[PDB]
Each structure stands twice: as C-alpha cells, then as structure tokens.
Amino acid sequence: GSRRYDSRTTIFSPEGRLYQVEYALESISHAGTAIGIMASDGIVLAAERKVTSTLLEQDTSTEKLYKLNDKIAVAVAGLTADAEILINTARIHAQNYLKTYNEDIPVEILVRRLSDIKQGYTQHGGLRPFGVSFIYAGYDDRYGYQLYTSNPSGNYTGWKAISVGANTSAAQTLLQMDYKDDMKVDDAIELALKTLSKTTDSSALTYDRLEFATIRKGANDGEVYQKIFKPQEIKDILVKTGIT
Amino acid sequence: DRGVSTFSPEGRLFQVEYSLEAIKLGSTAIGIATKEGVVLGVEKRATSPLLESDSIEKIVEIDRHIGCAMSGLTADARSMIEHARTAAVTHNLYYDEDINVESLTQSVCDLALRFGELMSRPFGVALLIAGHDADDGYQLFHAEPSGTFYRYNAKAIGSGSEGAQAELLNEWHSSLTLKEAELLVLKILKQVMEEKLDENNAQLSCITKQDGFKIYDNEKTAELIKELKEKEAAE
Amino acid sequence: TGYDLSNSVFSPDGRNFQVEYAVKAVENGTTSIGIKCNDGVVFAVEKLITSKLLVPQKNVKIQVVDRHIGCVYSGLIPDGRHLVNRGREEAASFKKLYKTPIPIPAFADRLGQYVQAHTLYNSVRPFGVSTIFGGVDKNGAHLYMLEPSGSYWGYKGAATGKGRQSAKAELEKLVDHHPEGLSAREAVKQAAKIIYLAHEDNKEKDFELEISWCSLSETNGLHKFVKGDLLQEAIDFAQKEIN
Amino acid sequence: MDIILGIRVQDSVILASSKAVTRGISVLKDSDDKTRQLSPHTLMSFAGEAGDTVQFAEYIQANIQLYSIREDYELSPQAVSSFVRQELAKSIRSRRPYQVNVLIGGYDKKKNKPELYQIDYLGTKVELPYGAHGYSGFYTFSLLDHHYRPDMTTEEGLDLLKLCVQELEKRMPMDFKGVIVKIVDKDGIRQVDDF
Amino acid sequence: GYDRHITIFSPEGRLYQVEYAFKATNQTNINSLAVRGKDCTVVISQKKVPDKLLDPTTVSYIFCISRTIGMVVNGPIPDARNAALRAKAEAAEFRYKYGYDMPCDVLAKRMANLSQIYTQRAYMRPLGVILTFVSVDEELGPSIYKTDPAGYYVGYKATATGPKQQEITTNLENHFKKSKIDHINEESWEKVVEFAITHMIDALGTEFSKNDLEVGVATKDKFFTLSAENIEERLVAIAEQ
Amino acid sequence: GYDRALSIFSPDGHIFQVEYALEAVKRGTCAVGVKGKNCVVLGCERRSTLKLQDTRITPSKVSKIDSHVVLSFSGLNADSRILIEKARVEAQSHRLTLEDPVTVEYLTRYVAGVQQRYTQSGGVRPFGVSTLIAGFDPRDDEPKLYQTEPSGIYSSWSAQTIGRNSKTVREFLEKNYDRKEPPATVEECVKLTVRSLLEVVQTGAKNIEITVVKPDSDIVALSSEEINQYVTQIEQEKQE
Amino acid sequence: QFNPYGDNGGTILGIAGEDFAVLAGDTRNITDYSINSRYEPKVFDCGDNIVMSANGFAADGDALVKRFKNSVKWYHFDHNDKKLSINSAARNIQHLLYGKRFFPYYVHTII
Amino acid sequence: MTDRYSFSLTTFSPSGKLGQIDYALTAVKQGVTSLGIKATNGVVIATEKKSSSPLAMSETLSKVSLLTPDIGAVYSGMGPDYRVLVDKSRKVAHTSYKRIYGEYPPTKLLVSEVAKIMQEATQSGGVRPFGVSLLIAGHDEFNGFSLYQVDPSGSYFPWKATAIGKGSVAAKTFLEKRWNDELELEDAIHIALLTLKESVEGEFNGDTIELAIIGDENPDLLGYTGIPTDKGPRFRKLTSQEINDRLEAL
Amino acid sequence: NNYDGDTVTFSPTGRLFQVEYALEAIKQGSVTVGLRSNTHAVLVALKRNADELSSYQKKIIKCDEHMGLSLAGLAPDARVLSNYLRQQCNYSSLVFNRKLAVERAGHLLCDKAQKNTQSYGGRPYGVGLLIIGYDKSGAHLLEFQPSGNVTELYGTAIGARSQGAKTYLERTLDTFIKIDGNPDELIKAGVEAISQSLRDESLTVDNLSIAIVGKDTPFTIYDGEAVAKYI
Ligand SMILES: [Cl-]
C-alpha cells in the first residue's frame, strides 16, 4: 500500500534527534542572516535579503520583516512561504486574545502558541516541519521589551541579542563581544548593521539588500511605535553609522 | 517496512511473537492456585537503591474477588487494568452480581489483538489474573498479548519463568494449603531473583473467598521470609 | 524494477503487472464456459472432486443475480462471490429506481466499472477471477466475459480457467457449424461436451458437471439450474462424444 | 437565586449577596454563599437559574485559575470580565444557554483601583460605581444615586449598603435571609462576618 | 527509485507514471482519426476483432457521451469506460445545474482537469487513455478537443491518435497545406466520412472492409455511430471513383 | 488521518522509538530532585553555551503544575510544554470535579499515562522527555518526589537525577543521601542538591537553578546570589 | 399527528409463594371497544426458570420480552452457560427499560 | 480506497534541500520562456505559443489568463498545473475577498492567496508541488501597477521586470540593460517583443506569440453603461493583428 | 518472498502468500475431526495444553441451538468468526423467525474472510473451522478456510496430522453416513477417525472434546467425564 513511500517525518534517530528538524535547521543555515538586538529603550530588527537583483521592486517587497500586531514583529529566516502560513496564524491568535480579554497579547504567550504549532508538526501528523526560524521582537506592560527566537523543533528561548539564518556562529560572537546591558536603541542599530556588514557573504552591504525595523517607546508619551524602515531610510542609517 | 498485522511464513503474527520477547525481559511474577485461595507474588526489581520500592505496583486489585500480577512493559498494563476494573464494575451494575473470573479474563484478552493500521501495537505485558467465583471456585489465568488465556494450577511469567515453571511442576499438588503456597512463591522467587529476596524487593498477595483480594504488608511478608529460611535450614 | 510490487503502478511498458498476476490465479482455476443460443444463454462449470467426502450437487458454484442473470467464474472463488454480491446490490438499486430488471449490457458495465476500480489504487488488490455471465433482457440474449483488468466484451461463446484453450477451440467450431444459430437444449448438451473435453487439462482428479441456463422459451427468460433428467441427458451426450 | 448587590468605593469593591436558597415552597438553606473567588484580587457574585449559576461560576473560576498557573500572573479585573462576557455572549446562542447574571468585583493591582463589572446572562457588560441584578436595583438604586460618592471609605460603603439591605427587607415580598458581604481591596478578599 | 512508481517529480522534473500512462495508450494497437466538415465533425477508428468468439457489435472504442458530444478513446477498454461513464455523468450534471448542453471543449477541459489531479495526487493513478471529444457546438461549430494522461488538452482542426498517429497527422497536415482551410469543404457528412476513410487508407497503406472500421459522426443537435452497412455504403462510394 | 505505527516491537523485544526517546533525554540538561524531611528541592542544569540570554523571559526549567506541585524535566524542550499544559489542565479539572487538588502521585500517574499512550498510538512518536514531579499532597507534610520517562513507567524516589551525566550525579547521591536521616532542614537539602550538580555542571554561576517546594503550597525559586552562597560555602569546605 | 403508543388492555398478576411463584395473565387482546384476539398469550417462559410479562402496549411488550429472551441467550454465551438468577434478570431488565428512558416501553413488566 | 497518502511527499534531505521543490523548478526551467515588464502607466506579460501540432488550434490554448478584471497571469512549466491554478486563483479571488469586501483583491493579496495554494502542495499529504512558476501582473487603486513572480515553493517576489523558463538567464540580462523607471507601456511592449524574439526559434508573429497588458480602463470591454464608477477592465489581451502591427516597428 | 509483505499483493504465479501463511497456522494447530450421517452431525476435537499445570484449550464453540463449530489455529480469530455466526444466526431468528441454514452460514463466513484478503492494512484470519448443524435440509458439515473457501462435506479433518483422519473417513464414507438414529455409534466413528491423527499422546479424559447436533438433539458439547464413555 501507501506505507512504501512514507518518509516518516516525525521519528527519532538512534542518537535521539528529529531527522527533519535537523535538516530543516540545515536549510535555515543557508537563509539570509537576521539579527535582533534588545536595548533598554527599544528593540532593533535587522535582516539581509538573499542575493537580490537590480530589477527587484524593493519598496513593495517583504521577505524578512513582518508585523504580527502593533506591539510585536518578527524577522524570518528560511522558507518565506512557510513563514507566511505561520504569520497569519499568529496574527489571528493575537486578535483572538484581544477579543477575549480586551488586552493586547503578551509577547511570550504569542511566541509559545506559534512554537507549540511547530512542535506539533515534529510529533504527529506525518508532515514535514516548517522550515522557518523566527526572531520575535515585541513589547508588553509586564516584561517590557522582549526578544525571542523559535526554530522548526518548536523550542523557543529569550535573548538580549540574537541572530538566525546564515553565519550565526560568527554573528553571535560579534554581538557577544560588543553588547552591553545599559545599551540604547541608536547604539543597537549601529551594532546590528556592523555585525551584518562583517558576517555577510556579499562583497558589500547596501540599502537594497537589507530590511530594517525598530520597536521604540520613542513614540509620543507612554506607548510603543513599530517602524518598518523604507529603502531610503535604510540608505540614510547606513550613511549615518558609516558603513557606506 | 511491513504490515503490523503481518503473518510470518510459519503462521505467527510477527508483532505478537516480538511482544513475547519483551515479556521474557520483564521481572518475575508467580501465581499458585489452591483450594484455600490463590497466591500472587512478584519480583519488584528496583533499578537503584534510591527508588522507594513500595511505589513499585506490580500487583493490582481488579475487584474484591479478582487480583492481578504483571510482567514485562508494566506501563502497558495500566489501560488493561482500567478496562478490567471497568468490566468488573460494569457487569455488577448490569447484573447485580460478581463477574466470573474467566469472563473478566476474556474481556481483557479481547483488547489484545485490537491493533493494526485501534492501537498501533500489541501489549508488551503478560498478566496473571487470579480470583474466585461461586461457579468455578479459585482460579488462576495467564493472559497473553496474543489474546489467548490459559487457566493454570500454578504459573510463572517473566525472566525466570521457565526455571520457575519447572520448579512449580514438581512442587504443586492439589492439597496445598495457603500458607504452603505463600512459602512456595517466596521460595521460587528467591531462586530466580538476581538480588537477595527480602520484604522490600518482593511482594506477596492473595485472594480468598472471605477476605477478598489483599496485598500483603512488608511486615507480614518479612515473617513469611523468616519462616521460609528456618524451614529450609530444618533439612 | 519494483513495478510489480504495487497495484495501479504502470510499468515502463504501460502495463499493470498486479492485474496480470491476478490473471495467473484465474488461469490456475477450474474450467468454466458460456454459450449464447437462439433465445438465451447456457453456463457450465468444472467442479473438481478433491475427495470422496465432498457431498455431490451441494457445493454450487454458479450464482444467480436478480432472477434473470447467471454468473459463473474461474479463479479465487471468494473473489467471485464478492463480485456477485456487488452485482446483486447493483441490480437491486437499478430495479428499485427504474422499475425494470437490469439489462445485461447495463449489468455488465456495473461489474466492469467495479472491477476496474480495483486497478486504480494500491490499497486494494485486483480481482482474481474471470467471470462469464449473462441472461435474457428486453433486447434478447446476451453473454459476457469479464477479466481482472475490468475488460469485458459480448460473446457468442466464452471460456476461462485451466482448460480455456481446449474449450475455446470447441466453441469456435460451434460458431462456424451453426451460423443460423444454436437452440437452448442443444447448447446445454454442447456445454456438457465442452466441459468434458476441457477436463483433459484437469485430468488427475475426476469432476462434477454443473450447468445452468436462461432461455425465453425453455425457462421464461429466468435463470434456472439444469437438474435431474435434462442434466443426465447432457452428461450421457457428453460421455458418448469423448468415447 | 434572588438579590446580589455591588458597590465600588475609593479603595475597594464590596459585594452583598443573599443567603436564602428557596425551592418553590420551602427555604432549603439560609447560609448560602453566592460567590466564587476567581483570583486573589477578583471576586464574582452570581444569581440566576438553579444548577446553571454554580456550574458557570466554577467553570469561570477553573479557567482563570488555569490562566493564573500557566502565566504565573493574575489577570486584570477588566480582562477577567471580558472573558466572562464572551462566555455568556457565546452561551446565549447555544442549544441550552446559561441563565446566569454576575457581578465581578476586583482590585486592579497595576492601576491601584477598585473595579465593579455588572454582566447579565445575555453577555451585557457595564462598568459601574454600584450595581445590582434582578429586582434588587429597583429598590436600592434610588438610595445609591442619592448617597453615593466616589471618594467614600469602605466603612461608609458598608453603611450605605446596610441602608440598601434595610430597604429591601422592608419592601421586598421575599425573605432573602440577609446577605453575606465581602470586600475586595489591595490586600485581597475578606468576608465581613457581622452584618 | 520510488519517484517512478507514484506521481512525484524525478530529479529531471519529470513524472514517469504520466509518461508510462502515455505508453498504455497504444496497448490496443488501434489508430483513430478526427476531421471537421462544414456542418459536421467526423471521427473514424480502426476496429479489430481478433477472436471469432467475440460478439463484434459489443467491441467499440467510440462512445455517445451526450446527445451532442461523441468521444473516441485510444487505450485499454476498462480505463476507456471509466472515462466514458464519468464524461456522461459530467455532461448530465452540467445540463441540470447550468440549464444548457455541455459544450465539447468544456467537457474536454473538465476531463483534463480530472486527469491533472491524478498527476498531482499520489493515491490516484492516471488513466492510460487519450480522449478525443467531438461535436458540432452551438457556439463554436464543428469541434475536436483531445485530452491525454498529462491533463493536457487543446482544440484541433483535425487530429490523429495511436501507434501510427504521425503518418496520419502528416498526411492530414499536407492536405490542409493545399486547401488552406481549417476543415473539409463538403456539404454532406457522408462525403466527409468518405474523406476520413480515404486519407486513413492512404496514410496507413491498408485497405478496409466494413468490419475493419468504426465511424462516429457529429451533426447539429445529435452525435451518432454508423452501422456496418452504413460504412459499407461509404466504402462502395470510395471504390467507385 | 495519519495512522502509521511508528512505535513498534523489534525481533529482540524492544520498542526502538521509546528507547531513542530516552537518548533524547540523555542529551538534555541535567535535572536533579532531592527530598528532605520537610521539603523537596529541584535542581536543574542550564548549559552555558547560550550566553546573551534573557533569563527573565526564557522558559524556566522548573514549572508549576498547581500551587503545590512542580515539574522539571530533561530532554526535548518543545515536548515538555505539551506534557506541562496537559498536566496543568488536569490539575484544574481534578479540583473542579473532586473538590480537592491533585496528589503528587495522581498528577505523576496522569503525565506517565499520557507518555505511555504516545508509545502505542498510531501516527505519533513518544515524548523525548523524562520528568521529575515533586510537591506535597493537600493537608499533608510528607514530601513527594516522582520520576517519569518516555515508556510511561513512573516511580517514587528519595532522590533522583535525569538528563546528561545523570549517571555521575546518581553515583554522588547514592553515597551521600542517607534514608534513615534525610536533609533535616531546607539549607541541608539545597546544599546537597547544589553539591550533586557541582559534580557535573562546570561553573556554579548561572548554570545552576534551584527551586525549593515546602508544604501548604510554599514554592520559591532561589536567586543567583542565594545559590552562589551555597557554591562558595561548598568549595571552601572542600579546600581541606 | 401520529401517536406511536396504543393500549392493548389486558391484566396480569404475579404472586410469590414460599417455594414457588405464579405469573398469571388474561388472554384477551383489545383496541378501544373491539376484541383483537380471545387467546393471545401474554405471559412467556424466557428460560432459566424465569417467567415474564410486559402488559400495556403489546408491541412494546413483545419487543421487550423478545429483547430479554435474547439477553438470556447471550448471557449463556458470554458467561459459560451460567444460570441467570432472578435478581440478575431484574437488574438487566432495568437497563433495558431505562435504555429507552426518553421514549419508553409503555408497559408494566412483571417477572 | 481512501487517500492513504496522509504524509508529506516533499521532505528535507540531509543537505537541507526540499527535493521536490528543486525538481519542480527544474521542470519550470525546461518550460517555454515567459516574461513580464512593468512600465509607469502599465504592465506587460508575454510568452511563446508553443504549438504541439500545426493541426492544433493554438487560439484555444490560452497561456495568458485573466484572473480578475485588473489582474492577469502567465506561466512557465507544466500547462495543466497552470490551468487548475488559474481556476483556483479566480475562485479564491471571489470567495476569500470579493464576497466579503464587495471589490476585487489587490494584486499582492491575490498573489498571496495563489502562493498559499502552491505552498500547501509543498507540505500537505499525498501531493507533489505545482510544476509552474507564475508571473502575475495587475493593478489596484492604492498600490498602482505591480508585477509578481510566484515559484513552486510558494515564495513570491515583486519585479520591475523579469523572465522565467527556458531562456530566462539571457532574457533577464537583456531586460536589465533596457529597463528604466520612465518607460511608457508602448516602450515596455516593444522591449517585451525584442526580449521574447531571442528565446523563440521558429515563426515569430501574432499567431505564435501571446501577449497581454494591464493598462488603462477599457469601458468598451465592460459590457454595460450607466454606472460612472465602473469604468471597465484594465486587463487586455492583445490581438494577433495588434501584435503584428508592433512587429513592423521592431 | 517480495510478495508476502501484505495480503493485497499477488505473486508472479498468482499466489497470495499472506493467505497461505494464515493457512499454515491451521496446520500448526491441534487436530479436529468432523463427520455426519443423515440424522446427526458430530465434531471431535483434540484439545491442546500448554503444560501439565495448564488447562486444555477449548476447541468447540456453540453458535446456535442447531449449529456450532470446532476450531484449529488462532483461537481469538475463531472467537471473532464464531461471534459473527452467533449474530447472523440470531438475526435470522429475530427478524425472520427462521433458523439459519448451514449452507448460508458458510456463505457468510466465506464473504467475511474474503474482505480481509483484498484490502490493505488488515490480515487474513489465522484459523480453520469445521461447522456442523441440523437445519430444514437435514444434517450438514462444512469446512471453512481463511482463504474464503467453504466446502460442504460428509466428513473431514483439519489441523496437524489431519491427513490420517481424513483418509480413514474417506474409506469409512459408506459406513458412517448410514449411522442414522444412533448418536453414540457416530461419535465412536469420529473418535476412531481422530485416533488416526494421534502420535505419542492418546485420548485422555481432559484431552478429548466432542460435540453433536441432530434431528431431536440440540448442539451440545461433551467435555471431562462426559467423554470417558468414548475413550
Ligand atoms: Cl474542474
């Protein structure tokens, strides 16, 4: 019957690893590097678009940085199509929570929900896992600014600064070297772009090969503003920090 | 790979034959039926001294007139016990009476072959179901994962089974007393066990018409162990 | 290779080897035949007497569908029974909705589509039977033969099983020597002969002859088993021709 | 059940709820506590059809307690009330709706404010300084309209509540066997044993 | 090498089960041809009754799908009948739901979409058949639309299918290169059938008796198959000029 | 639905998927449980490969199932969340129907039952998780400590460890833990738990988490500095 | 409107002796003012020395008696030909009757 | 029966490759060249009508398809997969958008919906990915003119201009030199015809080329008058004659 | 070989190996004998024990007052099939007030066993059954195989060493068929038949199992000291 052709996506190796999760992570290691850096007064999301063309319409393009609600955003690493399935689920969960409790969803609860979905695809159903790793940047009134990451296993962890995708070993060393706890958003912006500039497999880091975003309490009084940077604004911040 | 319910060329179900190998690895359990009662005894086999051995529950009550001992993958037995308890209670609800030991055993054994591609594999545990009813008196059954159950005068299952069964072969007769059976289970357990038999790493139980199914206290079993040692030293 | 391990898999030829292996089971079975006559059809089958302990006339192989259709098959007997059970359901629902009994060509496609359905998936096995069937409807007599692939045609004479070549040769002579046609009572006698001649391929064990027929004149268009004197008359005729 | 009142003062919420439980002809109990603690600083009183009331209250209680454990965090009174309202709004279009009216008195530890929410069986939520369900409002609201002030102390709130209960005991035909009063403040929930 | 057993992509970007279903198509060893007249669409197909025991009247690869649509099949008869029954059901449902007779090209698309599903979904195998649908459509006029196991379909001026399709195709190609029109300029369907048979004879290089052919004709508001005597009359006219 | 029998018997009588789930537990960070006379302490390893972590928001290794019971684990982190959720739900369902919180034994038996069900259900793999469940039964001052594992077997322990290098810390506990006189105070029990982790952990900085559970729903997690004081005192006594 | 119930009349009587028991019933079956039958047996031997009668709506009575007799048969199969005691029969009948709690057997049963 | 293939047929290999998606892209590579160019006041999509036989009527086979009145699509790869995708795309444009908001979806969202269908075939049980790459050109009020590519994986990218299939590498290089941000629609059509000539071997005319535009509103093609706000479809398929006219000025 | 992984797969010679392996399980099973006259039908079964402490596995199952069978092979599968027969017998009685014909009972067993041989996932039944009964056309004896093949016979035997008993019956055919209105002599012929299949072991009191049905005889099983008469 059909058994003959079954890959068996949800099984342990003899070593106690989930084959497909490991291979999905290998897939993600080739994706464009995404970096998150959390500061005391905001969060930075910086990400590298993969070998773009001159004919790509950059201003209407979105492959890396997506908005989940007004307070939470995500940086994607891996299959964009897989990520969008999960992003629409997360967007719904946030609105379900808002409808039920009349309060914006706390960041961790959203992250857990998405991470639980990914876990399900590794334990049951016989389907391949989502080949996606997220960096979640978000704010709530309980924990303030938060950075998380999730991967195809469905395991998630919290971070002060973190990279996903390509060259994370190199990237995480550079972040670990220059990061400090009292750091500010404008400093974190500079660190994010400097790290990408050194870890990039491209010859030079330019505005057209980047997506960039900041979650700031730099909004008029006690409230939070998400800023997805436009191509011209990414070009300006590259000149400001002194990379181009 | 291959079907779960596949027949071998010899005419046996592969999975059922493999589950029997799991049961051979399990800890020893011995049952002895007499006209004064049935005795059930088990090797606890704690994997470390820090494990509180009184938490090892390999002897279990199904109803007041039916007890049960297990050997093999003991986690698999929990749903079997649950079904057995439910079957025993449900029959009492429908018929205002105790359920026959055989009928209970049959109800448990009907689960065994409900596997395919229902559950995904046979049970990896054998059961010694011991009880009493008015029609057939004191009874001991051996319920396998094949769905087959044999009634026994005495039976050993687990890692020391064929050695213990040969010993039960010689020792059993139709005029055994309950006290004689208790000592005989303890004797044979001590023989096949790796570690030295005491009240903490071995458990006794019995089922009598008057008092029903009872698990023995460690203090009570300790006395029967001391009584055994003396009677073996006596010749 | 591996194209013969799963049903519904095209080999590089364009063939479904599992169906062709089902044919081998059919070829292993006993001989069964069909003869189309003037106003009806005659079915006959070889029943191997495995032992003296078999009760004569009891293990009936030919089956009736509705009241006007006869079915006989060679190969895996249970598979044939399963197909007839379906045929009876098809014929019942037809008559339920449309009032009239199912026409034979209509009935033939109901079996055909069902057997063909068992060559579409790997989760089922093809039928291990060639079925010869037919009867009398409003448009007259019809004889069909249905293979494991779902392939079926109308026939003047039909034969399947281990003695099919022997039988087919005999059927071809009848078609040549009777262009104007064959009568129902003639066809019963000839059916008996052909089974007796086809028994040379299964000559180790002795056998029991079983015959049935539908005929507009002889049975009012209804399926009936050939019994008693008419059966013995056909056996005598058959025994005379082999000697 | 019959009479449930609620009043939000300066620094606490006070809920008064009758003790009588009547089954048609006889008063089966005169000491029934028509309330459940949903979280340490959130109390829900309730009244409506038999069985439904307690089943609903305990179901809400369990869900909030489940949330409290999962997140290691107490939901705000507003959040709990919104959850409760949704459950009732879902209920009203069911095969058999919950016939239960509730008051949710809670102290928001973040804002340092007492909060009273009145929700009926339809899922009709309103935040109020003082509230009631059933016929209770008809007698008491005229007194509360007059005497209520937003800066009242808890002791002043209890005195105003006594005046409301006295008016009910005078003019209501049913003997509701007095009320159990409970206070919800920054320190949690406590019961006024003498009333 | 399980990428050749089920309908999934091979490393080359190929579906081998679809390609092997195309090979099952020629297993009957029958050649079909379809051409269009002014008022009609004619389809002819070789008829081969090898066994004398067969009732030759029941041996047919041409089907009457609806009153207006006819279908000829190149491939094994079980799959042919599978397709035929479905196309009949689809044509009938279409009329019930939408209030007018299913067009030939729409049916061809519907059957092609079904065949596409068997190329994508693994549990369903492709049918080893090429379905040539013919009608005189009320909007488009004389119509030939053909479907295969790949789920491909297209309209035709004329077409040919079978082991010797290429010889027939080129023969027809050369005729339409002379005439420089998309059809057979002929009033009666009788002469269009005569054209079809003549150009099959020339292409295949074989002579036909009445029992060697099978003919289907689509006119306005009906499709019908010719009897052996109707074909004989056709063969007589060909021989007499 | 996907019905495929993933957990099946092999010729030698083993269920490899259950055994490979144990290998995932062997990979997981070390967890330890030690019960004193009037307390239970759950120690947990945090691997220091991950720095730049946010320890405020990162999922803690010890989880409250109810106000009186806690659950730590070793193995797949994602898998552990599913067991914890189910356990938490069952804890509230038990309170709702029985009008009494779960016993530690009951809660363990439930989690172990869930783990077992996944070893003979179609279309699912076993949980790559072993748990340590600890706490105090309602209105009871006797400490409770249980262990579960992928196969679905569970049992009670005076002290126990699971995860990577658990063989070493079990060796330590087997010689240092006396049953006749367990750690009489909270201090003594925490000290023995920190000591046992220090055999394996590497650095005694942020790599040790300690959670102390006491009777009557008194659960507290120690801070870095509080644990660091135990680490300091242990090594100063060791220098002799 | 369709009324699924009917009254077939009749009267039954059970008396328990010291070492015996009787279950009597008239043999008249009726609808409204007409006699259907002057001899329609109402009390049945169900095996295992149990007698039964389900008086009232005869269709429901016949259905119940039929089902209990069947219950007796399966009790023998499932439990090694054990005799169904009168007390066990009674409890089994409770579950038969209560099984249709919300569309009852319109009968007064005596065994 | 039952679809017993409830498990994924596309899975991650040790290297992190999704084999079936790569092979689907290989199938797309073998397919006939199609392209898209965005201008300031329009978008053009074009491809070669590769006729399987000269007896076949290539007008009946439409490679360029209307999805909504302001959105059009062209492909490279497996035609049958494209045909069912166009059916599903048209339907989803109604069910998940028009029947809710009372208007047609914007290009990007319809693309998103198509992409979702193609992703699901990449992860769901018992199916292979679609063996096509789409180029979807469209217009909507708030985003203006846009051109998107959609791949077998479900990934989609917006383009100023691009090409897919047989001679895509050469064609993309050709477009990079010619494209600028000040092109008029006629200039884009001219470049499209030049670019497409390089990949075509045989006949190059209006009968062997399919070409459509997303441009100005066509009130002549609306079918009715009387509602000022309804101004007609921006999608228009160029006729065989209209193509040949521009081939003379080539 | 490569075509024995499941029941849904024909071999190149047209064989169903899983069915043949299920057939093999019957040959491993203990011997049982069936035989009939015109008035009575008899089952005689050799019961098998695990060891000397164990009981002897029951081989005979009652299906109705007028029908029952003896088993050989997987006993749980016989339990499933006998339970199905009990129900079908019971449905015939309840709905039609009609005792189920033995021939029709065979047809139902055949069809039930067949569905397991054509579908994926399942397995064939691993048991052979000998059904005896007395219906409106007199005494009957059937032989069920899990291939689906059911066969009406005068006498037969299935199980290990069954060929000896089957040869004896084939010789005795003309004698035992004529044992009308004499149950004890028909049982004697069955006991003498099953004796031809014995090696080493002999018929003891708790080893032998006999059943009988007839004209004025309900299906009744004889075990223990009830069969000591015939030893
Ligand atoms: Cl369609």
Author numbering:
A (entry chain P): 1 to 244
B (entry chain R): 1 to 117, 125 to 242
C (entry chain T): 2 to 244
D (entry chain X): 1 to 195
E (entry chain U): 2 to 242
F (entry chain Q): 1 to 240
G (entry chain Z): 1 to 111
H (entry chain O): 1 to 250
Task: Tell me what the authors wrote about this structure, in their words.
Upon the FDA approval of the boronic acid containing inhibitors Velcade® (2003) and Ninlaro® (2015), proteasome inhibitors are of enormous public interest due to their potential as anticancer therapeutics. Hence, the number of studies on selectively and specifically inhibiting the 20S proteasome core particle (CP) has grown exponentially over the past decade and confirmed that some pathogens modulate this fascinating multi-catalytic machinery by small molecules, which have originated during evolution. Thus, besides peptidyl inhibitors, a distinct class of proteasome ligands has emerged: small molecule β-lactone-γ-lactam natural products and their derivatives. The chymotrypsin-like activity of the CP harbors a spacious S1-site that is particularly shaped by the hydrophobic amino acid Met45 of subunit β5.
Interestingly, similar to SalA, the homoSalA derivative inhibited the chymotrypsin-like activity of the proteasome in the sub-nanomolar range, while it was two orders of magnitude less potent towards the caspase- and trypsin-like activities. Therefore, we elucidated the yCP:homoSalA complex at molecular resolution to investigate its mode of action. Inspection of the experimental 2FO-FC electron density map displayed the natural product derivative covalently bound to the N-terminal threonine (Thr1) of all six catalytic subunits owing to the high concentrations used for crystal soaking. While the active site nucleophile Thr1Oγ opens the β-lactone ring, the positively charged Thr1NH3+-terminus acts as a Brønsted acid generating a C4-hydroxyl group from the hydrolyzed β-lactone. Although reformation of the β-lactone ring might be considered energetically unfavorable, Thr1NH2 is well positioned to catalyze this reaction, which supports the mode of action of homoSalA to act as a slow reversible CP inhibitor, similar to what is observed for SalB. In contrast, the side chain of homoSalA is stabilized by hydrophobic van der Waals interactions with the aromatic side chain of Tyr168 in subunit β5. Moreover, the crystal structure of the ligand complex reveals rotation of the chloro-n-propyl group from extended to gauche conformation, which is required for possible cyclization. However, while the well-defined fluoroethyl side chain requires only a modest change in the dihedral angle to achieve the final conformation of the five-membered ring, the C4-O→C-Cl distance in homoSalA is approximately 4.6 Å on average and, thus distant from the required geometry and position to form a tetrahydropyran ring system via the preferred SN2 trajectory (i.e., a chair-like transition state). In case of homoSalA extensive hydrophobic interactions with the cyclohex-2-enylcarbinol moiety stabilize the ligand in its bound state. In contrast, only few interactions between the inhibitor’s P1-site and the S1 specificity pockets of subunits β1 and β2 are observed, resulting in significantly weaker inhibition of the caspase- and trypsin-like activities.
